[PDB]
């Protein structure tokens, strides 16, 4: 019902967004589309 | 009264918690200076110009005379390491006091001690705090004078021989020179205080500023605001914040122009060439190349009828031609040897250009401060290859943005401080709407 | 009843049909000077050598322009950022040839517009209002500073400021894109979103309030007569509007607090236009839009073009043609 | 009360996402237009239609990905999956540009579905249908730009491709080829879009700075109640302020909100008319009087002639790569260029 | 008493399910080399 | 298409001997060219003197021919004008002048080979783009 | 002001929800990854791999130039790679 506290769900979800987006920006400098 | 998104406004009348917020925030500032310097140093390569490496703090230290020798060559990186470690260490002490005063310390100070406690409306106390900080600032400016005169000097891009560290023995004290700057026009060829082009004036200005600040600090510790000042201002914490926001705004705009135009306290050796500098260097480069091929650059008429390489400014000075005609107010150490009383001297141009001047112009022309947000260097149509954005573009743009927002911050808090002081910041009283007791306009 | 106090009472009087105020004391002369010079120049000024190459550009109606092509032309590149008032010229003829009127107009206007913003604060204070309408206006004002002052400062010349004319504006735009790739700059992208979104929400709010007007008139009269100026009761049913819009999307995507809604209406285009003003203001220092030219190459190293490379082709065309006689050297560094 | 009424009942149940009869058209078509765009920008090339990479799979980023228009050789083919060009081969269909028609056609029917939804919900709730009427403006823009415009030209190829930078290319194409900034129908659109954004900001700010004090908190949001009868801000003070600041002010709350509907909707409708003209190359490209004088008098120069030189650079420099099916070979010596550059 | 499967449930997963699949595919793409 | 040994095969000297680079050497030479040369020679042009480019046909007609590894390695040690008549070490980066061009200090002999190999391979991939300038962007 | 569905905040803070979705989410992420790492995405969509935009000595785009032979034209371009 209200087990996992909401503020913990938001933190983990938010850091998951940061990870995925960060990996896309790393990819702008490596491999395809990096100009190298 | 305030929602969570305005939560720091709950600190307005909690002097002990507000002290913790300020001191913790100071630790953040000193932390960034410490960590950024180490990051820059960890990434530093001495064989590359600083401005090819995205450095903004190391160039500030080098300008003070630490770590560099003739020509701006980095000779010793240890002063960079020390400046960064000492800042980094000090942020722990400020963080420690900050969080203590914000969480555990007394919530308000005025019960604990009449010295440290304050009421925003106490004009005597407020000007006393101001005076203390004025003295600190005045000491701060004298530290730069101390470094320049007694502890090794400052880096001087104008020094004969390519630039070098130089002790300043004759700072300018003549107030006609020092205050003459404050009264120069900000327009082209004049440049207000941004035109300061020698270290003697820089050091002399800081002697003056230190004395004025210390004098003003003692003045404000000893006095209370006069009645004309009392009737002209709003006396509240938010009003004081709004005044400082306006001041920071003005200073950010000035700093923007300082880093964009000035190559004295922002040496091009470290920060790269200025916009005007790089544009002048391109004309120089092709003057040199064409003249070596046999071109008589003095007599060469360009497509418009103006000289292809050399023309006159609107007041007659011989200057570089092309679109760089706009940049003829540029002055720099690699170019001044070619200047006579009427501008660029054609005899010196024919006979006295040195290889070091050819190299420098080629270098500056190919490091003009143009680049993309993803750090592709050059004009916007250039292909990928060169990873470069000038430190001057980074420092100018960042501080223009900050200066703009702080001007908006000033408007926001100035208007609110006025409304709060008069009692209508929360909206219009339905039972006493001023317009309803006014006559109509028609 | 002192003479200075009587003047002071008139300047700040809330009974003047148009509020004057202390900001108005500066605003009224500077705006009149700028307006009068602009009208006269637009109609009659002779051609101006904007680029300093002795190639004058005709901007005024009497010299063969219409409303769309006419302009007050920016001042000569030979002047750069030098201050050029009338009394620095040997003659008005000189001052006109070199584009002196543009400087007089933009300086008087930026001063008068800045005081216009202050005047908005000032009257709000005399009427007992909240103070932040002037903060909304700082977004268009900052945009005017960017194209009239900031961009010339960073580029070194008022000759690269935006002309006071319709076709001159488009000229400024095209050249800006060739040299800064503004379309690929995120602050301009945010400006488009502030301007597109502002138009969207204007139409949304207008249609939702109009949709939920309470029946107060007959079919033979304008519904507008169902509202009387200064009536105490609201004129539409916000719960009905909320009930419609919440079902059009989903419930929690619709406002039912009018204060929150109108604050949102204020903030979206204001912040978007702040960013686009900041975009011009930072491209003034040549921090340009994203460059993905030749960012995709294949296993051998062949360039694989993207739409960014097509943009570059168009930008190259604008680059090579603009100011076709003003460049003697290969790089257009300013 | 037969099967039709029973279905009516279920479609109009009050639920988290209202469905309605309009939902039968809207939800499939909206989902497919959107899913088609995300699929194409993640996975699908434009190599065979444009000579362009255009997907994340190929190395593109969010700004450069696109679902690109079909090759010029397809004309205005519907490019049905089962049609004569792809012949039911899903892979060939992607490579020939079929996702573009898929998205444009499903998007069009989704827009219809959305406007019917606005009608349907308004009828059930009991409000006037002005939100639907305002939405006519985005519809006119979409159909004029994505359908009418390429239908007047040689092929779909010249419609906008669905991507950030592809649309940027569309803007610049229209400058250099149509001189679209010079077109009074676009200028009226500009005034409607910027006038709408102005009205949005100025109205929001005015309400927020003429509020009545209806609570004691410093956050003034809490002092509003959706069922209160009373106006939450002072129209009388707002009118006085603007009358003294600007000379004139609104006095009628109904006119004001109608005008906010009117200004951006009308602006968009005007621009759509101008694009319909450009479908036929019916441009406002030139002023004949300027051209006659400038041809005869080489000292006559305006911002108008300056811009046409820019347009000529754009055309000659982007056309070979932008219209690859035409096999334009422009030797270096024919390219228009000013001095040095 | 709350149902588990609703029209809402369908709409949510209609969007959420291919979204995570797509994020997985785009993540893998960051490691492709030419 | 791919980086095959045939494209990675470039002349070693004027005599006609050839050398076949590795992919690694090509990528190394591209990185080093960007580090030490691209600020003036991006895309095979010369920003400060556009009359002279890095196209193979241009290098072939220089005196000392420079369309081979040896000629290019020698140029990076002791650059001359295009006719061979004067040494230009004091205005052009080289090992002979690494005191005034500090980026040349830490280039080893194999770095020079990779840089030279990059310059010779790249026109084989890019064609007219290499040294063609903005017309071919 | 509710339509009878279970509130979202109740679902995502519930244990059972996380029991199911700590499996379903990584599985979907892994499936999408494999769609690319196995190369299936190239084949399904016909997207060139980095080695198959051009033939070895080829600098011409394989542009479709016929409406009704288009499918065959692509197929001939592909053969000329292998
Ligand atoms: C209290 C209220 C105050 C109100 C005051 C009202 C009057 C203000 C006047 C401001 C207008 C000034 C425009 C600046 C023009 C320009 O050339 O300004 C640049 C000048 C620097 O001038 C340049 O200064 C140069 C100095 O360099 C010289 O010296 C150097 C020394 O090393 C080098 O050698 C260099 O090569 C050499 O040329 C040269 O003189 C150039 O020719 C000259 O252009 O900067 C400056 O004076 C520094 C300050 C400029 C700040 C202006 C920023 C405006 C921001 C507006 C904010 C927008 C508001 C948003 C509203 C919403
Ligand atoms: C989900 C959301 C989570 C995150 C929320 C944050 C939202 C906003 C921020 C977006 C973050 C995404 C991008 C982060 C990665 C990035 O930027 O990555 C970029 C770099 C790291 O990348 C490095 O970027 C470098 C940039 O070049 C720099 O380094 C080069 C090589 O030394 C040259 O020296 C060149 O001149 C110099 O500019 C090179 O390209 C390196 O190869 C590359 O590794 O991070 C940096 O720099 C770090 C910069 C952060 C400090 C901010 C400073 C910016 C102040 C300038 C702003 C002025 C405003 C102007 C407005 C326009
Ligand atoms: C707002 C309302 C909202 C509701 C919107 C809902 C969206 C519904 C979906 C719309 C479907 C439209 C697709 C129509 C395709 C079309 O037109 O496709 C075009 C084809 C004609 O085909 C084209 O024909 C051209 C001319 O060919 C002719 O000329 C050649 C030269 O001699 C040869 O002789 C050739 O054999 C001969 O056929 C070229 O060959 C093109 O390549 C080929 O595509 O017409 C046909 O299918 C039919 C055309 C005739 C019927 C006209 C229908 C009107 C619709 C367009 C009206 C706008 C008109 C724009 C003008 C500006
Ligand atoms: C520089 C940023 C900054 C600083 C210094 C402060 C400081 C403060 N805020 Mg503000 N605040 C900020 C940003 C900041 N805020 C932002 C961005 C928001 C928007 C979300 C808010 C919203 C906000 C609200 C809504 C409120 C405050 C309040 C407060 C005060 C009490 C907070 C408290 O007791 O928390 C207690 C919190 C904890 C005990 C959790 C642990 C926090 C610790 C300090 C983390 C520090 C970790 C650090 C690594 C320690 C290093 C130790 C080492 C040096 C030895 C305090 C002075 C409150 C106030 O005014 O009270 C009257 C209040 O109500 N703030
Ligand atoms: C401007 C910042 C500032 C201000 C106004 C205050 C003010 C106060 N603090 Mg706080 N504090 C600060 C920073 C600050 N502190 C920092 C940085 C720390 C961490 C070290 C602390 C840690 C701290 C603790 C742990 C306690 C206080 C207490 C107090 C109160 C009594 C202090 C007293 O009588 O000392 C008398 C004055 C001195 C002993 C001064 C000695 C000489 C000093 C250190 C020289 C200063 C160095 C120089 C000027 C600048 C720094 C050098 C640097 C730039 C390299 C007073 C309200 C006490 C309190 O509230 O009691 C409940 C208490 O227990 N403070
Ligand atoms: C952080 C710095 C600071 C701050 C915030 C204050 C704040 C204050 N001071 Mg103090 N003051 C300071 C530093 C400071 N002072 C220093 C260093 C000195 C020594 C020189 C003095 C000397 C001083 C005196 C002698 C007096 C004050 C007074 C006052 C009060 C009224 C100020 C006023 O009306 O300004 C508004 C400014 C004016 C009315 C005139 C402005 C004229 C300037 C030069 C215009 C130029 C602005 C221009 C647009 C920007 C370009 C700069 C230009 C110079 C080129 C106020 C509490 C007054 C008071 O009540 O003291 C008890 C007073 O009589 N101050
Ligand atoms: C020294 C500077 C300074 C100081 C001390 C204050 C202090 C204050 N301000 Mg002011 N403010 C400032 C500058 C400053 N402001 C500037 C420059 C502006 C213009 C933008 C404003 C605009 C402003 C408004 C509009 C309001 C205040 C308010 C307030 C009060 C509440 C602040 C709060 O709780 O925020 C809490 C903090 C947050 C909610 C978070 C802010 C998050 C920012 C916007 C995001 C920045 C991200 C950054 C770009 C980096 C992105 C990277 C990514 C990883 C995030 C407090 C008295 C409020 C007030 O009037 O109270 C009396 C109020 O409503 N301020
Ligand atoms: C600007 C500061 C340059 C840098 C950095 C590099 N080069 Fe250069 N290069 C430059 C000029 C002005 C010239 C012409 C010199 C002359 O007057 O003859 C050159 C020439 C070359 C050549 C010869 C080209 C030819 O014969 O066609 C080569 C092979 C060359 N440069 C190579 C080169 C390398 C390998 C660099 C990085 C180590 C490099 N240059 C940097 C200007 C500049
Ligand atoms: C109040 C509050 C807040 C804030 C806070 C703050 C802001 C704080 C600060 C803090 C700080 C500011 C901290 C600091 C820290 C620091 C430290 C802890 C340091 C340490 C260091 C070290 C340990 C080092 C080491 C080294 C050396 C020595 C050498 C080199 C290397 C190295 C680096 C390793 C918040 C918002 C959260 C919330 C609310 C409340
Ligand atoms: C260091 C240096 C130097 C020097 C400097 C100086 C010496 C400075 C000074 C400065 C100054 C000396 C400043 C001043 C300032 C001022 C101001 C800034 C003012 C302000 C004002 C105001 C703001 C006001 C307002 C008002 C009014 C008007 C009305 C009434 C009300 C009020 C009050 C609000 C030099 C350059 C040489 C060189 C380099 C270094
Ligand atoms: C076409 C087609 C089809 C369909 C398909 C579909 C339907 C699809 C879908 C699809 C989908 C449905 C997809 C999705 C995807 C998504 C994504 C990929 C997303 C992403 C996102 C992101 C990246 C975000 C993030 C962020 C940021 C960045 C910032 C802020 C925060 C956030 C978190 C928001 C079919 C079968 C019929 C067949 C035919 C063809
Ligand atoms: O863009 Mn191109 O860059 Ca800024 O200057 Mn050099 O040319 Mn000219 O003055 Mn108007 O314009
Ligand atoms: Cl032009
Ligand atoms: Cl030039
Ligand atoms: Fe409203």
Size of interface B-D (CB pairs under 8 A): 52
Q: Decide if D88 contacts D81 (C-beta within 8 A).
A: yes
Same domain, B281 and B158: no
CB contact under 8 A, G56 and F127: no
Collapsing DSSP states into helix, strand and coil, what is residue E8? helix
What is the CA(B99)–ligand 7 centre distance, in A? 20
Residue A36, CA distances (Å) to B293, C130, D341, E25 in order: 38, 56, 28, 22
Q: Which residues contact F32 (CB under 8 A, 6 or more apart)?
A: F107, F111, F114, F115, F118
User: Residue B47: phi, psi to the nearest 5?
Assistant: -75, -15
Distance CA F92, CA F107 (A): 15
CB contact E30 to A (< 8 Å): yes
The response to whether residue B424 sits with its C-beta less than 6 Å from ligand 5 reads no
Per the CB < 8 Å rule, is B428 touching D234?
A: yes
The CA-atom distances, in angstroms, between F30 and each of A28, B428, F55, F121, F137 are 19, 69, 16, 10, 19
Domain count, chain B: 2
Q: Name the maximum alpha-carbon separation found in chain F.
A: 42
Whole-number Å distance between alpha carbons of B148 and B169? 8
CA C175 to chain centre: 18
User: B216 vs B135, C258, D8, CA distance in Å?
Assistant: 8, 50, 82
Measuring CA to CA, how many Å separate D213 from each of B417, C136, D222? 17, 21, 11
* Contact (CB<8Å) B418/C135: no
One domain, residues B74 and B200: yes
Q: How many CB pairs under 8 A join E and G?
A: 46
Report d(CA E17, CA G28) in Å as an integer. 7
Distance CA B117, CA B104 (A): 17
The reply to whether residue F129 touches residue C316, judged by beta carbons under 8 angstroms, is no
Residues facing F9 on adjacent strands: F20
CB of F13 closer than 8 Å to CB of F68: yes
Q: How far apart are CA D107 and CA B276, in angstroms?
A: 51
Q: How much is the CA Rg of chain E, to the nearest whole Å?
A: 15
- Segment (H or E) for C273: helix C258-283
Residues C1 and B4: their CA atoms lie apart, in Å, by: 49
| Two structure tokens written together for C304 | 């694989």
Rounded distance from Cα D76 to ligand 3 centre (Å): 7
Candidates C105, C118, C213, C208; CA nearest to C162 is: C105
At residue C236, φ and ψ (nearest 5 deg) are -135, 170
What are the structural domains, with CATH classification, of chain G?
Answer: 8-81 (1.20.5.860)
DSSP code of B373?
T
**CA neighbours closer than 13 Å in the CB half-sphere of residue B319:** 23
CB C174 within 8 A of CB D310: yes
Cα(D41)–Cα(D21) distance, integer angstroms? 31
CA distances in angstroms from D328 to D309, D315, D317, D334, G70, listed in the order given: 20, 11, 11, 12, 21
Name chain A contacts of E26, Cβ cutoff 8 Å: 24
| Number of helices followed by number of strands (H, E) in chain G | 4, 0
Query: Which two three-digit tokens encode residue B93?
Result: 């002490």
Is the shortest distance between the CB of B98 and ligand 9 below 6 Å? yes
Contact criterion met (CB below 8 Å) for B392 and B364? no
Domain count, chain A: 1
E-strand stretches of B145-213: 154-156, 164-166
Tokens 């220092």 identify what position?
A: C285
3-state secondary structure string, D194-211?
Answer: HHHHHHHHHHHHHHHCCE
Q: Are strands F18-20 and F9-11 parallel, antiparallel or unpaired?
A: antiparallel
Do B298 and B398 have their domain in common?
no
- CATH number, domain C186-315: 1.20.85.10
d(CA F79, CA F56): 17
Annotated ligand binding at E13? The verdict is yes
Query: Which positions in chain D touch E29 (Cβ < 8 Å)?
Result: 56-57
The first and second tokens of residue F118, run together, are 């990059």
Q: What's CA B329's distance to the chain center, in Å?
A: 21
- The contacts of residue D129 (CB under 8 Å, 6+ apart) are C211, D118, D119, D122, D123
CA distance B322 to B314: 14
Which residue, G52, D313, C304, is CA-closest to F129?
C304
CA distances from B27 to B20, B92, B94, B386, G47 (A): 10, 7, 5, 37, 53
Is B376 close to ligand 5, i.e. is its CB under 6 Å away? no
**Which of D59, D62, D65 is the mutation pick for testing A, counting most A CBs within 10 A?**
D59
User: What CATH number did the domain enclosing B286 receive?
Assistant: 1.10.10.670
Distance of residue C140 Cα from the nearest chain D Cα, in angstroms: 9
Any idea which residue has 């995570």 for tokens? E20
CA closest to D208 among chain B residues: B427
CB burial readout C135-174, b (16+ within 10 A) else e? bbbbbbbbbbbbbbbbbbbbbbbbbbbbbbbbbbbbbbbb
Q: How far apart are alpha carbons G64 and G71 in whole angstroms?
A: 9
**Pocket-forming residues, ligand 6, beta carbon under 6 Å:** B 127, 130, 134, 182, 212-213, 215-216, 219-220, 223, 225-226, 229
Can you give the residue range of the structural domain that contains A19? 1-36
Q: Which residues line ligand 10 (CB under 6 A)?
A: B 178, 181-182, 193, 196, 201-202, 205-206, 208-209, 232
> What's the resolution in A?
2.0
* Half-sphere exposure at residue B421, Cβ-oriented, CA atoms within 13 angstroms: 17
| Ligand 9 contacts CB of residue B88 (under 6 A) | yes
* Domain extent for D253: 1-341
Same domain? For B284 and B374 the reply is: no
What six digits make up the tokens of B33?
A: 């200076």
Dmax over CA atoms of chain B, in Å, equals 89
- DSSP β-ladder status, B310-312 and D66-67: unpaired
Which DSSP category does C46 fall into? P
Return the ligand 8 atom nearest residue F104 CA: 38
CB-based contacts of C32, cutoff 8 Å, min separation 6: none
Q: Are B403 and B256 in contact (CB under 8 A)?
A: yes
Separation CA D67–CA D93 (nearest Å):
13
Neighbours of B144 (CB within 10 A): 18
Q: What is the 3-state secondary structure (H, E, C) of C163-178?
A: CEEHHHHHHHHHHHHH
Any chains having at least 3 CB pairs less than 8 A from chain C are A, B, D, E, F, G
Neighbours of B202 (CB within 10 A): 19
Cα torsion through B28, B31, B35, B40, rounded to 10? 80
User: The domain spanning residue A13 has which CATH number?
Assistant: 6.10.250.2070
Q: Which residues of E1-34 are buried (b: 16+ CB within 10 A; e: fewer)?
A: eeeeebbbeebeeeeeeeebbbbbbbbbbbebeb
Got the DSSP string for C80-117?
TT----GGGSSSHHHHHHTTHHHHHHHHHHHHHHHHHH
Tokens 């200004």 correspond to what residue?
D263
Distance, in Å, from the CA atom of B337 to the CA atom of B353, rounded to the nearest integer, reads 9
Q: Which residues, other chains included, contact G8 with Cβ-Cβ below 8 Å and sequence gap of 6+?
A: none
| Residue of D42, D61, D65, D165 to mutate, testing the A interface (most A Cβ within 10 Å of its Cβ) | D61
Asked if C295 has any chain A CB less than 8 Å from its own CB, the reply is: yes
Contacting residues for D56 by C-beta, under 8 A, at least 6 apart: D41, D42, D43, D65, E26, E29
Residue where the block lists tokens 């020679």? F41
- Residue of B4, B8, B27, B40 with the most ligand 9 atoms within 8 Å of its CB, for mutation: B27
Residues B285, B253, single domain; the answer is no
> B21 and B130 share a domain?
yes
Instruction: Measure CA D103 to chain center.
Output: 15
Are the C-beta atoms of residues B64 and B167 closer than 8 Å to each other?
A: no
Longest pairwise C-alpha distance within chain G: 68
In chain G, residues 7-46 whose CB comes closer than 8 Å to chain C: none
Say if the Cβ atoms of A6 and G10 lie within 8 Å.
no
Of F121, F117, G47, give the one whose Cα is nearest residue C296.
G47
**HSE-up (13 A, CA, CB side) for residue D179:** 20
Most ligand 12 atoms within 8 A of CB, residue of C51, C321, C322 to mutate? C322
User: Cα torsion at C256, C259, C261, C264 (round to 10°)?
Assistant: -150
| Of C80, C16, C86, nearest in space to C52 by CA | C80
Give the Cα separation of D338 and C329 in Å (integer).
11
> In what helix (H) or strand (E) does residue F9 lie, and over which residues does it extend?
strand F9-11
Helix ranges (DSSP H) in C92-237:
92-97, 100-126, 133-145, 151-155, 166-180, 186-211
Closest partner CB to G3 (pick from D15, D45, D95): D15
Going by the annotation, the residues of the binding site of B for [CaMn4O5] cluster are: 336
Phi-psi region of D159 (alpha: psi -120 to 50; beta: other; left: phi over 0): beta
SS3 content of chain G, % helix, strand, coil (to 5): 55, 0, 45
Rg (CA), chain D: 26
Both tokens assigned to B135? 């003295």
Q: Are residues B130 and B3 in the same domain?
A: yes
The residue whose CA is least distant from atom 5 of ligand 4 is B21
Tracing tokens 């360009």 back to the chain, one arrives at B302
Is the Cβ pair D230, C233 closer than 8 Å? yes
Distance, in Å, from the CA atom of B14 to the CA atom of B24, rounded to the nearest integer, reads 15
Specify the DSSP element, H or E, that contains F10. strand F9-11
Distance CA C93, CA B418 (A): 49
Question: Are the CB atoms for G51 and E32 separated by under 8 Å?
Answer: no
Experimental method: X-ray
Determine the structural domain holding residue B283 and report its residue range: 273-368
d(CA D65, CA D162): 9
| Contacts with A35 (C-beta within 8 Å, 6 or more apart), sequence order | B384, B385, C292, C294, C295, C297
Radius of gyration of chain F (CA): 14
Q: The tokens of C16 are what?
A: 């003047």
């Amino acid at each position: 019902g209200g087990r996992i506290p909401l503020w913990i769900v938001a933190t983990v979800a938010g850091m998951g967004v940061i990870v995925i987006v960060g990996l896309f920006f790393y990819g702008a400098y490596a491999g395809l589309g990096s100009s190298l | 009264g305030f929602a969570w998104w305005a939560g720091n406004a709950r600190l307005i009348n909690l002097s002990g918690k507000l002290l913790g917020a300020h001191v913790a925030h100071a630790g953040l500032i000193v932390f960034w200076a410490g960590a950024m310097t180490l990051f820059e140093l960890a990434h530093f390569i001495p064989e590359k110009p600083m401005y090819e490496q995205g450095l903004i703090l190391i160039p500030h230290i080098a300008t003070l005379g630490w770590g560099v020798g003739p020509g701006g060559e980095v000779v010793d990186t240890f002063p960079f390491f020390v400046v960064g470690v000492v800042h980094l260490i000090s942020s722990a002490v400020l963080g420690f006091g900050g969080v203590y005063h914000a969480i555990r310390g007394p919530e308000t100070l005025e019960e604990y001690s009449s010295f440290f406690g304050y009421d925003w409306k106490d004009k005597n106390k407020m000007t006393t705090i101001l005076g203390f900080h004025l003295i600190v600032l005045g000491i701060g400016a004298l530290l730069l004078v101390a470094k320049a005169m007694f502890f090794g000097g400052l880096y001087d891009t104008w020094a004969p021989g390519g630039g070098d560290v130089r002790v300043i023995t004759n700072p300018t004290l003549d107030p006609r020179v020092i205050f003459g700057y404050l009264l120069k026009s900000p327009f082209g060829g004049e440049g207000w205080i941004v035109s300061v082009n020698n270290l003697e004036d820089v050091v002399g200005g800081h002697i003056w500023i230190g004395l004025i600040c210390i004098a003003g600090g003692i003045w404000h510790i000893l006095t209370t605001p006069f009645g004309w000042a009392r009737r002209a201002f709003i006396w509240s914490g938010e009003a004081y914040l709004s005044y400082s926001l306006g001041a920071l705004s003005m200073m950010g705009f000035i700093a923007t122009c300082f880093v964009w135009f000035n190559n004295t306290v922002y040496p091009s050796e470290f920060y790269g060439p200025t916009g005007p500098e790089a544009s002048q260097a391109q004309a120089m480069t092709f003057l040199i190349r064409d003249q070596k091929l046999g071109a008589n650059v003095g007599s060469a008429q360009g497509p418009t009828g103006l000289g292809k390489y050399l023309m006159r400014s609107p007041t007659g000075e011989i200057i570089f031609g092309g679109e760089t005609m706009r940049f003829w107010d540029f002055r720099g150490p690699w170019l001044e040897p070619l200047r006579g009383p009427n501008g660029l001297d054609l005899n010196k141009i024919k006979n006295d250009i040195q290889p070091w001047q050819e190299r420098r112009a080629a270098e500056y022309m190919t490091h003009a401060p143009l680049g993309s947000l993803n750090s592709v260097g050059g004009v916007a149509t250039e292909i990928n290859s060169v990873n470069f954005v000038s430190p001057r573009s980074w420092l100018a743009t960042s501080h223009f943005v900050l200066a703009f927002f702080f001007l908006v911050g000033h408007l926001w808090h100035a208007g609110r401080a006025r409304a709060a002081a008069a009692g209508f910041e929360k909206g219009i009283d339905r039972e006493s709407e001023p317009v309803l007791s006014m006559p109509s306009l028609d | 009843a002192n003479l200075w106090e009587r003047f002071c009472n008139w300047v700040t009087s809330t009974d003047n049909r148009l509020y004057v105020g202390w900001f108005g004391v500066i605003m009224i002369p500077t705006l009149l000077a700028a307006t009068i010079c602009f009208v006269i120049a637009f109609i009659a000024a002779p051609p101006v050598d904007i680029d300093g190459i002795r190639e004058p550009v005709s901007g005024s109606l009497l010299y063969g322009n219409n409303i769309i092509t006419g302009a007050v032309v920016p001042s000569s590149n030979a002047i750069g950022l030098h201050f050029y008032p009338i009394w620095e010229a040997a003659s008005l003829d000189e001052w006109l040839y070199n584009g002196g009127p543009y400087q007089l107009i933009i300086f008087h206007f930026l001063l008068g517009a800045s005081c216009y913003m202050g005047r908005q604060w000032e009257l709000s204070y005399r009427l007992g209002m909240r103070p932040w309408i002037c903060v909304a206006y700082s977004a268009p004002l900052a945009s005017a500073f960017a194209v009239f002052l900031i961009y010339p400062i960073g580029q070194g010349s008022f000759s690269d400021g935006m002309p006071l004319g319709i076709s001159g504006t488009f000229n400024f735009m095209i050249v800006f894109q060739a040299e800064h790739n503004i379309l690929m700059h995120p602050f301009h992208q945010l400006g488009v979103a502030g301007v597109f979104g502002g138009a969207l929400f204007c139409a949304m709010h207008g249609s939702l309030v109009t949709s939920s007007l309470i029946r107060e008139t007959t079919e033979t009269e304008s519904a507008n007569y169902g509202y009387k100026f200064g009536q105490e009761e609201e004129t539409y049913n916000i719960v009905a509007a909320h009930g419609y819009f919440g079902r059009l999307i989903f419930q929690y995507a619709s406002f039912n607090n009018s204060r929150s809604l109108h604050f949102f209406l204020a903030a979206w285009p204001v912040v978007g236009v702040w960013f686009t003003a900041l975009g011009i203001s930072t491209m003034a220092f040549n921090l340009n839009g994203f460059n993905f030219n030749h960012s995709v190459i294949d296993a051998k190293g062949n360039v694989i073009n993207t739409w960014a490379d097509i943009i570059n082709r168009a930008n190259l065309g604008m680059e090579v043609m603009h100011e076709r006689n003003a460049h003697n050297f290969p790089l257009d560094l300013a | 009360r037969g099967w039709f009424d029973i279905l009516d009942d279920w479609l109009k149940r009050d639920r988290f996402v209202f469905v309605g009869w309009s939902g039968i058209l809207l939800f499939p078509c909206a989902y497919l237009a959107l899913g088609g765009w995300l699929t194409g920008t993640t996975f699908v090339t434009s190599w065979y239609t444009h000579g362009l990479a255009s997907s994340y799979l190929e190395g593109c980023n969010f700004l450069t990905v696109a679902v690109s228009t079909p090759a010029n050789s397809m004309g205005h083919s519907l490019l049905l999956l089962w049609g004569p060009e792809a012949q039911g081969d899903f892979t060939r269909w992607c490579q020939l540009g079929g996702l573009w028609t898929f998205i444009a056609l499903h998007g069009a029917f989704g827009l219809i579905g959305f406007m019917l939804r606005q009608f349907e919900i308004a009828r059930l709730v009991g409000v006037r249908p002005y939100n639907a009427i305002a939405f006519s403006a985005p519809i006119a823009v979409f159909v004029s730009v994505f359908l009418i415009y390429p239908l007047g030209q040689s092929s779909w190829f010249f419609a906008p491709s669905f991507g950030v930078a592809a649309i940027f290319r569309f803007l610049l194409f229209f400058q250099g080829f149509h001189n679209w900034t010079l077109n009074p129908f676009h200028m009226m659109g500009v005034a409607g879009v910027l006038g709408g954004a102005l009205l949005c900001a100025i109205h929001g700010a005015t309400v927020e700075n003429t509020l009545f004090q209806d609570g004691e908190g410093a956050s003034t949001f809490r002092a509003f109640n959706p069922t209160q009868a009373e106006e939450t801000y002072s129209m009388v003070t707002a009118n006085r302020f603007w009358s003294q600041i600007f000379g004139i002010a609104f006095s009628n709350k109904r006119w004001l909100h109608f005008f906010m509907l009117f200004v951006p909707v009308t602006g968009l409708w005007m621009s759509a008319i101008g694009v319909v003209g450009l479908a036929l190359n019916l441009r406002s490209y030139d002023f004949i009087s300027q051209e006659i004088r400038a041809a005869e008098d080489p000292e006559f120069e305006t911002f108008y002639t300056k811009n046409l030189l820019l347009n000529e650079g754009i055309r000659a420099w982007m056309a070979p790569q932008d219209q690859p099916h035409e096999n334009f070979v422009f030797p270096e010596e024919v390219l228009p260029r000013g001095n040095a550059l | 008493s709350y149902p588990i499967f609703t029209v809402r449930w369908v709409a949510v997963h209609t969007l959420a399910v291919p979204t995570i699949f797509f994020l997985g595919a785009i993540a893998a793409m960051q490691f492709i080399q030419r | 298409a791919e980086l095959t040994p045939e494209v990675l095969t470039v002349p070693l000297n004027s005599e006609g001997k050839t050398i076949t680079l590795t992919e690694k050497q090509y990528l190394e030479g591209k990185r080093l060219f960007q580090y030490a040369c691209a600020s003036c020679h991006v895309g095979g042009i010369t920003k400060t003197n556009p009359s002279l480019d890095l196209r193979t046909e241009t290098l072939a007609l220089a005196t000392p021919p420079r369309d081979n590894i040896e000629g290019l390695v020698d140029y990076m040690k002791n650059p001359t004008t295009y006719d061979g008549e004067q040494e230009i070490a004091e205005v052009h980066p080289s090992l002979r002048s690494a005191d005034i061009f500090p980026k040349m200090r830490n280039l080893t002999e194999k770095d020079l080979v990779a840089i030279a190999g990059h310059i010779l391979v790249e026109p084989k991939i890019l064609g007219d783009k290499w040294g063609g300038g903005k017309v071919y962007y | 002001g509710t339509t009878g569905e279970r509130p979202f905040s109740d679902i995502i803070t519930s244990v059972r929800y996380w029991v199911i979705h700590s499996i379903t989410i990584p599985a979907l992420f892994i499936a999408g990854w494999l769609f690319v790492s196995t190369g299936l995405a190239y084949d399904v969509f016909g997207t060139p791999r980095p080695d198959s935009y051009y033939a070895q000595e080829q600098r011409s785009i394989p542009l479709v130039t016929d409406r009704f032979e288009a499918k065959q034209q692509v197929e001939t371009f592909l053969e000329q790679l292998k």
